[PDB]
Every structure is written in C-alpha cells, then in structure tokens.
Amino acid sequence: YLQPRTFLL
Amino acid sequence: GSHSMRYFFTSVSRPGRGEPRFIAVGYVDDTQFVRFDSDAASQRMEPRAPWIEQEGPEYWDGETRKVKAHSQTHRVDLGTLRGYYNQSEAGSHTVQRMYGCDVGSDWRFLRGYHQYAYDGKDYIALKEDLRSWTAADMAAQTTKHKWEAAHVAEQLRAYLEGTCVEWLRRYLENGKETLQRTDAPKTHMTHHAVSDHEATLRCWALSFYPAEITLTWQRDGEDQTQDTELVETRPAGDGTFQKWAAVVVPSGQEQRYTCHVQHEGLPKPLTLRWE
Amino acid sequence: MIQRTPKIQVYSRHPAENGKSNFLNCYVSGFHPSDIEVDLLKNGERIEKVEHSDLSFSKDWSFYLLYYTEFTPTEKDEYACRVNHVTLSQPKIVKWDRDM
C-alpha cells in the first residue's frame, strides 16, 4: 500500500 | 518473528531529454510482491505474489494511480536537484528512495523509515522519532526547511505508524501460508586440499528464508577471522537464499575449526565440524 | 557522483548435477551507478534468452540484480557471467565453478 500523498524535494 | 513492508524506488535521468527510468518495487520481509518498471513499459502496479494477486480491481486501480504519482514526483525531483547542485542536463543522475514500517512478533509498530539518496549518497532521511529530518548537505537543508514548514513528518508519521502497519498486517494474514513460515538453512561442509600444507574448509548454507543469517568460523572455540572469506548472501531465484564462508587451515589442523550458523528458522544455532 | 564497482557471483540455483535441469545465476551487487550490462555465456558465447530481477538496493544504497537462465549442465560445457560497468576498464568475465 503506497503512500497516498506527494511531497517534493 | 518480526516483519517489514518496504518500497524501493530508483529514478535515473537520461541526457537532455529522454524520459528518466523509474522503477518501484515493494517487499514484505524478503518477498517481492509488487513492481512497476518504466524500462519494462509497465502501465500498472503489477502483482508478484499470489496473496496480493487476489486483491480486487479497486485495490489495483488505486495502487496504479499512486505509483504513477510517485513517478511524476521523481521526475520533478531530478529537475529540482540539478537546480540545487547547479548541474547540467547532459549528465545522468540517480535518485533513490525507500520507505516503510517494521512490526514485532505481536505485529505492533516498531519503526518507520522514509529516506532519499542522490547520486549514491545520503540526501535526506526521516529520523527515528518520525518528527525531524537528517539533511546530508546544504541542498538537502533547503528540502528540510520546506518540509518542516509544511509539517511533512507529521503527515508521514500517520502513514508509517498507521496505514503501513495496518496493510502489512492484512498482507501477513492473507499470505500466512508463505509469509509466516521460515525455511531453515540446509548446511554442509566441503574440504579442498589446496596444497600439501593447507586446506580450504567451506561451510555452506542453502535454501533458507528469510535472507538474514550469520556464518562464523571458530578455532578452538575462539572467533577466527584471519584466513577466512565470506561471500554476500545471494538469491537462489526460487525465493530462498544461499551463503558460504571459508577458512584456509593448516593440513592436519582441520579439527580445530568449527562453523557456526544462526538463522531464525533454526531451533538452535548450528555447529559444524569437518569430520 | 560516487562510483562503486560490482561484486559478481556466478552459481546455480540447485547443486549442479550433470544432465539435470537447473538455473544458472549471475548475481551483481554493490555497484553504483545503476546502469550495468550483464551477459550469461555458454562456451564463450552470449546466451540470448535471459531473465533478470527488478533492480533494488541495499542499506548503503548500492544496487543489486540477479540474471538467470535455464540450463542443463554437462561436464564438457563451460559457463560464465560477463559484466560491464562504468567502473571497469573492460568487461569482467567470471567463470562458473560449481563448488562456489
């Protein structure tokens, strides 16, 4: 189950 | 015993234009269960174990949407990092990312992970408390400040201590027949007379699961490391692993040497003697 | 970057017995960057039908891959793994030795 949120470097 | 769920992501840029490579692999313990590879023209998150294959179309639709979102994330990151390091578009660079969660024997949360490397070295990592970040250099400090202000660690902690462990438990139940059993190493020792003056003893461990194992030599009950060689644990290709450890001994002194095997699948540690 | 040269092991999935079907493995690990060229050789010539694992990496961020193919060992036939990588002057050939 992948993370549902996105965080950009 | 303990269990983990981990995802490993590799993103490799290509000179100028040309899409980067993106590959996503998911594991429970040492068993791969999902994959997506742009170099293999993947279009969906694909199952690789029968206990995950039984999940329905909504599950797979959702994992496919998220893995495509991770791919776009990494496409941005490669461009971002070239900016941070003042690097040209002509060179090839690599982003690696791993995250996931560990549970114990009672299947309760143990630890979570979320960390990145750029071009083969640490970039940023969620510390053990899941509240702060370790940044490797000044470019990573920019990321750290951004993620602190946006409260990223708090969001990730909710996934790490919650969603991850919750789905790991479900995977462990559906795959109880395969995931929750161990395969003890099958061990044996070989003797190859190298000269008239020395002989190599090689202690073998075969068909074991999980991959974690220790092989150590002793001379007369003390730990011996000189004249030894130790290969990396290697996959057999059928889900099990293999390893060997060797020591060169004086001919006639074979009986001073013992090989010791420790593995989660064994009732007790093994001692093997050439005899 | 930081460049790391691959470790290479060539071996069979099961203990090798002449005439019995088996799998030939070439395991490469510890390398960086990820692009690597791995060939399985039979008697000096590249075997064409070869499978591989999905690229992953270890706790030091170094990569690993398994290349494998079906084979039936005989006592006359020779096998090897041939690896090329940016850290290598020329491809490294590692011969298959069934006691290893």
Residue numbers in the entry:
A (entry chain C): 1 to 9
B (entry chain A): 1 to 275
C (entry chain B): 0 to 99
Relevant lines from the article:
Here we report crystal structures of one public and one private TCR (YLQ7 and RLQ3, respectively) from COVID-19 CPs in complex with HLA-A*02:01 and two S protein epitopes, corresponding to residues 269–277 (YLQPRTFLL; designated YLQ) and 1000–1008 (RLQSLQTYV; designated RLQ), that were found to elicit almost universal CD8+ T cell responses in HLA-A2*02:01+ CPs but not in healthy donors. Public TCRs are observed in multiple unrelated individuals, whereas private TCRs are distinct between individuals. For its part, the RLQ epitope, unlike YLQ, is conserved across human and zoonotic sarbecoviruses and is therefore a potential candidate for inclusion in a pan-sarbecovirus vaccine. The YLQ epitope has been identified as immunodominant in multiple independent studies, including one involving the BNT162b2 mRNA vaccine.
We determined the structures of the RLQ–HLA-A2 and YLQ–HLA-A2 complexes to 2.81 and 2.07 Å resolution, respectively. Clear and continuous electron density extending the entire length of both MHC-bound peptides allowed confident identification of all peptide atoms. Both RLQ–HLA-A2 and YLQ–HLA-A2 crystals contain two complex molecules in the asymmetric unit. By contrast, the YLQ peptide adopts somewhat different conformations in the two YLQ–HLA-A2 complexes, with an r.m.s.d. of 0.52 Å for α-carbon atoms and 1.51 Å for all atoms. The largest differences occur in the central portion of the bound peptide, at P5 Arg and P6 Thr, whose α-carbons shift by 1.2 and 1.3 Å, respectively, and whose side chains rotate ~60o and ~90o, respectively, about the Cα–Cβ axis.
